[PDB]
Every structure is written in C-alpha cells, then in structure tokens.
Design a binder for this molecule. Structure first.
Ligand SMILES: [Mg+2]
Length: 130
C-alpha cells in the first residue's frame, strides 16, 4: 500500500549532485534520478540508503553523514510513494555504475535541465534553495 523509498543527493567538492540513469537495454534511454532504493524489513532508512549506495555505486557512507533534507509524497494507481531525500557531502569511494547504469554529476542549479521522474522533481526545487 505505502512504499517507502529512500534517496540521496551526493554532493562533490564542486557542489554537483549525482544523478543516475538506467541503461537503455532493449529499448530507449530512461530518466535521470537520485540514487536510492526500497527500505527493507529490519533496516533503518539510513541502513537501506547506505547499502543502496554501496551496491549501486561503490560509494561508502556513514549514517552520521546522511542529513534529512525533504521528502516526496506521490500517489500512483496501485500504491502510495513516500520518499525521504537525504544529502551527503562526506563519503568514501569513487562513484562508478556497478549495475551498468549511467552517471552524471550536475551542478545543483542545473538539475531541472534534465528529464527526471515526476516524483523526483519537487525535490530538485528544495535543493536549489538550500
Ligand atoms: Mg538498488
């Protein structure tokens, strides 16, 4: 019924945020989005995000370095999405697409230049003003 997904705005030395794009596979190029994933049973939201970032990007993050920013809340035909967004400017590893996905570091004021899922878009506005 209610799906909880956590996401992260990873910030580099130059105030670029990382967006990722699923591979084109057998059809067309997908949308740009914040890295993240489902919050699973027996995991805190922070644990889930930390694991997602390590699985997807080989980026290593400490819970004390994840800061709540905002959340999105979005109705779909068959479930409700609640999506907490964290920011993180202190992490270890070099982001690489470990699941064959595409990576793009984008200056914060430029994020709304890129096609993004409808749910991710209010989150972009919050990032610009912070
Ligand atoms: Mg994942």
């Amino acid at each position: 019924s209610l799906l909880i997904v956590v996401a992260c705005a990873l910030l580099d030395q130059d105030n670029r945020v990382l967006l990722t794009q699923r591979p084109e596979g057998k059809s067309l190029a997908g949308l740009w989005e914040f890295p993240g994933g489902k919050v699973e049973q027996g995991e805190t939201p922070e644990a889930s995000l930390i694991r997602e970032l390590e699985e997807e990007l080989g980026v290593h993050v400490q819970a004390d370095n994840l800061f709540p920013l905002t959340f999105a809340s979005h109705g779909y035909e068959t479930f409700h999405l609640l999506m907490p967004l964290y920011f993180c400017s202190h992490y270890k590893g070099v982001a690489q697409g470990r699941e064959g996905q595409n990576l793009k570091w984008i200056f914060i004021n430029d994020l709304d230049k890129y096609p993004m899922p409808e749910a991710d878009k209010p989150l972009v506005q919050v990032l610009k003003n912070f």
